[PDB]
Write a protein that binds this ligand. Structure first.
Ligand SMILES: COc1cc2c(c(OC)c1)[C@@H]1[C@H]3CCC[C@@H](C(=O)N1CC2)N3C(=O)C(=O)c1cc(OC)c(OC)c(OC)c1
Length: 127
């Protein structure tokens, strides 16, 4: 499935080149510009655990998820991964726990040492 494919066929987008965040571009977005630090970014996403559970979806809420990029308001993999996206892009991200919730996890949804899959659509970004 898609998690296996990004695991086996994704590109390492980390600075460290530690394979901690892998990406596949599913739909090419517009132009060349990616968001900047501090931009208000609007996304739709779905997240899955490595056991196959869908732990969340913004689509199911009928509202985008909004955050300020590069401020640690989201897991590290998101700050790194969304920073690579163009407006209108859809990507898949595979997030090792060191770039997600680590050994702590996050109750109730996220176990310790969890590798996470996300599908993310960058809707818009604005200063
Ligand atoms: C405690 O409730 C939430 C916490 C967080 C988030 C969240 O989003 C609805 C809810 C977000 C989301 C989206 C950006 C990436 C990632 C993330 O880093 N954040 C910020 C942490 N993240 C998730 O891993 C996520 O989907 C999620 C969903 C959750 O519930 C649907 C959740 O627990 C309530 C949770 O706890 C850490 C995380």
């Amino acid at each position: 499935g898609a998690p296996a494919t990004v695991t086996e066929q994704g590109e390492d987008i980390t600075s460290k080149k530690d394979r901690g965040v892998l990406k596949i571009v599913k739909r090419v977005g517009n132009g060349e510009e990616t968001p900047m630090i501090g931009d208000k970014v609007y996304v739709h996403y779905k997240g899955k655990l490595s056991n196959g559970k869908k732990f969340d979806s913004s689509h199911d809420r009928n509202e985008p998820f909004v955050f300020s990029l590069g401020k640690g308001q989201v897991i590290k993999a998101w700050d790194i991964g969304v920073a690579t996206m163009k407006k209108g892009e859809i990507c898949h991200l595979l997030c090792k726990p060191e770039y997600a919730y680590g050994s702590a996890g996050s109750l109730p949804k996220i176990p310790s040492n969890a590798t996470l899959f996300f599908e993310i659509e960058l809707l818009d970004f604005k200063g």
